[PDB]
Amino acid sequence: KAGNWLPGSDAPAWLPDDLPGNYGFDPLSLGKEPASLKRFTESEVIHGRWAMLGVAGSLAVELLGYGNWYDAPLWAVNGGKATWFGIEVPFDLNALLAFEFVAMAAAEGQRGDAGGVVYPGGAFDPLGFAKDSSKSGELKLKEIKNGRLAMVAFLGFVAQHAATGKGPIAALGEHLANPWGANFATNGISVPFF
C-alpha cells in the first residue's frame, strides 16, 4: 500500500494491495469490478505518460523563449510559418495534420493490437531497468506518482491561463513579485464575489 490516502479511513475491499501506488483511494467505489479496474489501470498510466510529455514540452518552449504553449497554433490559425527551435518548417499545415494523423493511427492501433500490454520492455526497454522484480515495482510506483503529478500540473496550467491569459512563467513571476497581489484570489476570476 502506497499509504492510507486518508488517515483514519478504511480501505476498500476491491483494491488488491501490492500495486504501483495503491493508496486505496476510491471513496466513490468505481473499480469494484475487475475488467473496469484494469481499464482504469491502463488509462491512468498512459494518462500519466502523456501528461508528463505535455509539461516537458510546454515548459521547454516557454523557458526557452519561444512563446508559451498557447502561442504555437497562431502561425497556422492565421497566415504564417511553422517554426521549431528557431528552425522553421517549410511544409503544409494540412500536410503535418494528415502526417501526425496517420502516425498516431499506426501507433495506437499497435497499442490496441495486443490487449493490454502496458510494460512492453525488451526492445521498448533496451536500457533494461526493470530487471529487479522489486525495484521494478519501486520504479512503477514512482512512475505513477510522476504521472498523476504531471496531470495535475497540466490542469493547473489550463486554469491559470484561462483566468489570466498568461504564460505560467508569467504567473509564477507575478506571484514572485507579489504573492498577496498575484494570486487566484487577486485574480478575482476564480471566485465571483471578490
What are the binding residues?
A: 44, 47, 49, 108, 142-143, 146, 148, 160, 175
> Cβ-closest residue to ligand CHL?
3
Shortest Å, Cβ 184 to another protein:
8
Total count of residues recorded for the chain: 194
Binding residue positions for chlorophyll a: 44, 47, 142-143, 148, 160, 175
| Binders in 63-102 for another protein, by CB under 8 A | none
Q: What is the DSSP string of 65-110?
A: TS--TTTTTHHHHSS--EEETTEEE-S-HHHHHHHHHHHHHHHHHH
Shortest Å, Cβ 8 to another protein:
2
Closest CA to 61 of 71, 52, 51: 71
Shortest Å, Cβ 44 to ligand CHL:
12
Compute the radius of gyration of the chain from its Cα atoms: 21
AA letter at 170? A
Query: Which residues would be at the binding site for another protein (CB under 8 A)?
Result: 3-4, 6-9, 180-181, 183, 185-186, 188, 191, 194
